[PDB]
Amino acid sequence: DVLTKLLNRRFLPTIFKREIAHANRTGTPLSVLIIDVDKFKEINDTWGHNTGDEILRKVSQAFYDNVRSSDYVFRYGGDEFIIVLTEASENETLRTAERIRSRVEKTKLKAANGEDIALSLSIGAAMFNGHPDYERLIQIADEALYIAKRRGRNRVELWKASL
Fold this sequence. Notes:
Elements: H1 12-26, E1 30-37, H2 40-47, H3 49-64, E2 72-75, E3 80-86, H4 90-105, E4 109-110, E5 116-117, E6 121-127, H5 134-150, E7 155-158
Parallel strand pairs: 6-7
Antiparallel strand pairs: 1-3, 1-6, 2-3, 4-5
Helix pairs in contact: 2-3
PDB class: signaling protein
Keywords: diguanylate cyclase, signaling protein
Assembly: monomeric
């Protein structure tokens, strides 16, 4: 089962604290992908939890197929995910986030009647800029996610001082 490999949210602090410390001592880039499945509750209602669950499996599979073993993937809510990319440049991060978003879009799902289920991700991305507090890094990545949702979903957004 792919869903059992996912990390609980409670491990975010202890993991981020250590992973940030390492990124400052060495000067290696660090990035975060915050992901939320588009209109998931609406999908969960219409097609059922078995369908919602299978969606979470396909979506989780897309993650592990496009991250290293050295990266971390967390699942907090029903459709809420957090990916920590250790040692990934901005160029690499956006490329990774794009591979993930595209994969989910191009995964068509057959319904009970035989129709197609619309799948898409919204992804917020943010680069580590040296700040010691990890919550700041999650805040801006979540803010980036907020915009991707606000701008019509099925897209990636990178956090900037402009907003």
